[PDB]
Design an enzyme around this catalytic site. Structure first.
Site, PDB file in Angstrom:
ATOM      1  CB  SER A 202      27.992  19.564  34.084  1.00  0.00           C
ATOM      2  OG  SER A 202      29.166  19.599  33.306  1.00  0.00           O
ATOM      3  CG  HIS A 203      28.087  14.032  35.835  1.00  0.00           C
ATOM      4  ND1 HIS A 203      26.804  14.531  35.897  1.00  0.00           N
ATOM      5  CD2 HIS A 203      28.480  13.829  37.115  1.00  0.00           C
ATOM      6  CE1 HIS A 203      26.427  14.604  37.162  1.00  0.00           C
ATOM      7  NE2 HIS A 203      27.425  14.183  37.918  1.00  0.00           N
ATOM      8  NE  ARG A 204      30.391  14.524  27.004  1.00  0.00           N
ATOM      9  CZ  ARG A 204      30.413  13.313  26.443  1.00  0.00           C
ATOM     10  NH1 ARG A 204      29.364  12.509  26.489  1.00  0.00           N
ATOM     11  NH2 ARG A 204      31.488  12.928  25.779  1.00  0.00           N
TER      12      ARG A 204
END
Lengths: 371, 371, 371, 371, 371
Positions: A202-204
């Site tokens: 999860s990089h958003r």
């Protein structure tokens, strides 16, 4: 006498998706690779990327702040290098902020070729949607991964004769690195049992973090497998400050940045993946991975035609139903669904892009610019 | 409690086309008027504009250099004022470089309303074509002068339900200033005889200058009327350095910048107008003027449905044929053709834009941003 | 130096619909008028047309046989005159066989402008449908009477920017000849009482003739008014050979060919008109005529938006219902419905076509032919 | 009782692309094969075509002059044979002048089926573009090689339900003749070394010839391989009259007309092919050939999706870059790119066309002609 | 906590095409299967269906009268069960009258997913065309067997992002039952010789029956093979009352209802099939069957791209030509044509539908219903 081609990037995912394209252009053109960002940052990440991707010819030193100022700086700084080098064509992949520099290339009448064109999720809350429209509507040639994306472009009035479908870049990239990927010892370095961990990525970009944590908690109660969590520092801390983070304890482990090859090995051995990466549909299709897209909208409808994954969101109820459905009978080594023809048939995309560029520079210069 | 609306401009033609819109918004909203350019330049031109247009609330001091750097600066500088003022909606007219700041407004999820939308000339050599596509495809609501432009937008996949037709802004603007226009003594100040001069207006961006000069020469040989030439300093000199410029002598006169009202009076009394102004089709239709559009592509096809003018280009042969055709039986005071229904029926555009804004801020915030 | 324009016709309805266009082009261009047919036939019909339409520059002597051979001959013969005269542009009106010569003009890269474009009835049994598609899809510029026809063209992928709407040619033509029309003594020459005769006009290409005759019979029983029948010799005889033709007796009268002006006077005084003329919708709208279109498909949907007429077909039951509905409260001198905005607003079409031609010859030569 | 089907051709490439279609129709229908051209010419070329293609039932003796007169004659002459034979359906392949005779078939309400439909290069300088539009818009059923062409047809408003995709005719044709092709001794007859000659093929319609010659010169300097040049007599002479033609000497050799089978053998053994044949994309894809399309626009975009070839034009700089790129790692016997799914999956096109014809004659007669 | 999904059917072909979908949903959701019809009728047909399809949870007891009253009753009765069960999503397959109950689901804001969407034959005499439009335009998500059907939906303005292509359900269904199908002794039970009988199947809704009988007669004269005729009782009698029915005698045999598996075995061994079943194109493609579609319009154009079958209609002349063409060289065990990629690549449709449902319930609830 060679064609001078300038490829403009600002991020590691662009470089990865272009690495074969870059090699092919290096063989056959005077190829200038421009990175809009900071040389210091790139050398600090180069251990992790050390894939045989040669170093960019320019670092323009625009901090990727994702601000209105940094957008203005990419436009100004790319313009300087366009003036200096005077390329015959420019290449952009995808729709990061650096694609906004196409504005400078267009004003100079430099033919623009855009890869991974016609991404549409139809949710304008996704920041990339601003960039998508801009880059697709200013490029002279658009090159798509799918028929779906080609149709989206034609539907917005763009010229069919200058829209091509390359297919996914990922089959060629993966094939290039598969021997290294298979030899990775990442499972030994992290003491993991194949099929006995979740890989979450999860990089958003508060209420939603709590929901995610509850999903994580519920998955531990249900399966009692370790969770490997790959995310940004800003997000690690936010999670850690949350009330019942302490309940997860030994069952959660934050992963430091990894080499691409180690990371694919990890993917290929997870019980199930939960990811917001824009590459999950391709990765999960191509490598037959058990996967949830944890976003609420996405831009890879081709997956749904094939049965590739489930878009679960990040809340526990749908997440749990999705994980059961995906994992119950899944064997990565037995293909039962999820194969996408437009990915599967892509082949040597690198060769396709070069052939398109050579075939259309003059066409664009005549029909667009009347030169 | 009022709606806060921010209107963003960078040029005098925007301010003129918005002047009634500005008044209406000043009455009924908390209206912030932002000029991206230099306060010094604006005060040096204010004599000439002194129309009752109140002063902008901000001057952002970006020099209108038309460079990649100045584009980046408009984006960065508009962003600062968006952060400070936090408007509920933003307005842009047309497609000057300043419209590119819509990028900053969109990233902040501020509803964007765009006037004079869906201009298309289909010749990408016209620099405004880059800006046109960008502004039309990022705006939440587009407002067009014509059905032609509405159809162009729908044809590029934009939502019909958020595309409106206001009609031309110019009937309301002209009606506001017509008493002053009629009382202008510009003909006396320049010692001109009504219907016995050409008015030539050229303000757009070598072989072509020579062609234009030859056209001017040929018009003098044919009609022996004075030529009043309105252009930029850069262009006056270029013309003057040309070989047979000396042949024109008394039959050419460069006009200094003029007040809007004096300039319309001049238009209304010319034998024939040759113009590259983007407003000529509207002006010529509405005021029944004898006119040539001297460009090679244009974005007002509605004129051709009506018989408004001829697009002659700037070369002598077509120019001469066009002038004969237009002027032979033309009386400004007898309407025989050239009336455009979408202009003629526009009425109080100012009231329309405010009613659209009030009617769609919440709609956009729900359906676009899911707020 | 003038533009050389060549207008190509083969029939009297083309010449009538073009007569103002011809005058305007004669004033301002080197205008070559080409008739594909026989000089002998034209001089035998010239009494009836003697409207101030000057004589064509060429008669190509192709008999209008409506055969595959005559189509081939129009193409071959028009080609010879294109080679000889080398016009800068060619004009065609409508979709008679002579428009098929556009093939020769296109092969020579002569800009083609087509009036009354985008006629569609969607019944391919109508022979003109073959020609319609061909002429619309080969012309560089299309000019339509209506928005309906413009939309039909755009819907078949044709360029919106080279499609214009002139409106109907008929308001200008009628206005030109109205003083003569009003002074016609046609009612006295035929001993007719205004509003006490039917005018039936049928000039298109067995079971169906009997149906028509029965309709005629039923109208006599119902109204006891004389029927004036205008048709081709081939058709007069066919009717006469029919069983109960003798029952009509004094109540039917075949009209010899008439002057245009006499014929409009007759129209304007009929109780009701039954016509298969492609001009009935325009005539009936513009002159507020009581009218039935006796065809089974038609290409003027704009009439139905306005309430202009009824498309009855030619069978008695629908014909009778239609006549009652139209005539019961109709006064030509009181407008209650049937006005078509795209006709009513057409104005000086002649001026529009010339302005389009001057404005687009160079545009076409650049963007189509890259000259 | 059999269906009577009439296939109309005028050239050898039509006959080649139809040869399997012709066989299939001969088995199952009363099949009339009509050649619009001269019997004498056909017998003089029959040695070279002697493929087991039976002789046409008619030669209409229209000289293929490519003139407006010859077009008229094809229309007139095909009409005579339609009247005589009264076929139930007519077939056309591609868009040679002979397809213009579809006009006669349509006027007679004969169902028309068109193969290789929806070719679009979007450059109207290509003469076939006139014919393309005409034949596609008059045919009742269109049959395309690709999805690209099907979409182009639908985009021009044509009925999707009467548009089919057969795929390329060439896989079936090549498979039929491959045993003969492989046994060809053409390399021995011309004393050629496999992979050590260029094959250049140019059969399309001054400054440009010089450019081509310079390209040829540059290729000799670069590779020192013989050039085999296949072209028309008119063009051989024009080349020979050029200044530095004498510099090529032993390194250029004009090829006399060849049998199809010898010619494919030659293709399959060239170092690289430079061709303006409309079949090069198919040939190069299917046989994995190293190839340049030397045209400036083309109608096979499907190739670019696959990486089939480069459209180089005919000027030296782009030609040289293209040849290096194509040939550097190319092995005809190792497929690395260039496979086109719509070609590769075509299979027995012959069977498809017959099944379409049988399935749609009645449908067309009802829905188009209301018979 | 599980998602509650309700699948609504009214006929045996729905249940067959859904049987794998039903199994998959039973594993992973709270799956409610609703049959709108009569429990008594279902148990009388259950011998013949006894496939491992579990019994529906509800029988709503609406007699499938195909009346306006029965349509109203399906809407009312489905509404009651929606109120009671409150499903999170509803599934419909195809376009039987029972799909009209989607009206009730929509009014309750229940997400609707529709399989076999975008069937179009373009002949509104086919009763299913009413239902098709209704169900496609009210469903939130449409799922198609083909690209053709996806394009038809997009062409009617439906959202591309909520239209998916599953492919045919039949490959998965057939694969599930193929072992039983192969072991069927149906040929022994009916004393049939493989490839020595016609299988005729006609279950759709006077002059036309006589035509069919004459076709049957002509086939007996031509081939002297037995005809197995599968039809409805109403139709058996109508045929029997016909004059020369007695001429067929031993060469015609009406088949009682059969198990699915016996019936496919029979199909796989026929000399040729004549069918009006909406499944014939899929069956004939997938199993390589010799087949005529005896309808006059159809909705599986994908077959014609592949060469699957001939649409013959039911009249003797076209029927005979079609049978000769299909059967002359056909071997079910040698694939020479007829393979449809969108069918062939469908795979585990069951898994696809569940993954779509899980991925889009929340999306629909947000973007459609703003919940």
């Amino acid at each position: 006498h060679m064609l001078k081609v300038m490829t403009i990037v600002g991020t590691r995912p662009e470089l990865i998706k272009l690495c074969c394209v870059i090699s092919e252009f290096d063989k056959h053109t005077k190829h200038i690779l421009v990175h809009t960002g900071q040389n210091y940052a790139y050398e600090l990440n180069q251990v992790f990327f050390d894939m045989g991707i040669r170093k960019p010819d320019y670092f323009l030193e625009v901090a990727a702040d994702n601000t209105a100022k940094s957008i203005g700086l990419v436009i100004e700084k790319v313009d300087e290098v366009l003036e200096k080098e005077k390329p015959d064509a420019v290449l952009f992949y995808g729709d990061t902020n650096s694609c906004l520099s196409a504005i400078a290339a267009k004003r100079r009448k430099i033919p623009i070729f855009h890869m991974e064109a016609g991404n549409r999720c139809f949710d304008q809350r996704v920041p990339e949607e601003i960039n998508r429209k801009i880059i697709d509507h200013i490029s002279d040639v658009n090159i798509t991964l799918t028929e779906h994306a080609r149709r989206y472009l034609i539907a917005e009035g763009l010229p069919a004769e200058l829209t091509f479908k390359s297919g996914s870049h990922m089959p060629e990239v993966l094939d290039r690195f598969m021997p290294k990927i298979l030899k990775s010892d990442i499972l030994d370095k992290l003491s993991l049992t194949p099929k006995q961990y979740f890989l979450i990525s999860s990089h958003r970009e508060k209420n939603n973090l709590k929901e995610l944590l509850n999903s994580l908690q519920m998955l531990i109660k249900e399966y009692n497998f370790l969770i490997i969590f790959s995310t940004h520092p800003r997000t690690k801390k936010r999670l850690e400050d949350l009330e019942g983070f302490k309940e997860l304890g030994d069952k959660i482990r934050f992963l430091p940045a990894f080499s691409f090859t180690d990371y694919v090995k990890l993917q290929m051995n997870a019980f199930c993946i939960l990811s917001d990466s824009g590459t999950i549909t391709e990765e999960a299709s191509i490598l037959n991975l058990p996967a949830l897209n944890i976003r609420e909208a996405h831009e890879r409808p081709e997956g749904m035609d094939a049965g590739t994954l489930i878009m679960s969101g990040f809340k526990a109820e749908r997440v749990l139903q999705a994980v059961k459905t995906i994992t119950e009978e899944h064997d990565n080594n037995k293909r039962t669904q999820g194969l996408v023809p437009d990915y599967n048939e892509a082949g040597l995309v690198s060769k396709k892009i070069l052939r398109i560029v050579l075939s259309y520079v003059d066409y664009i210069n005549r029909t667009v610019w009347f030169k």
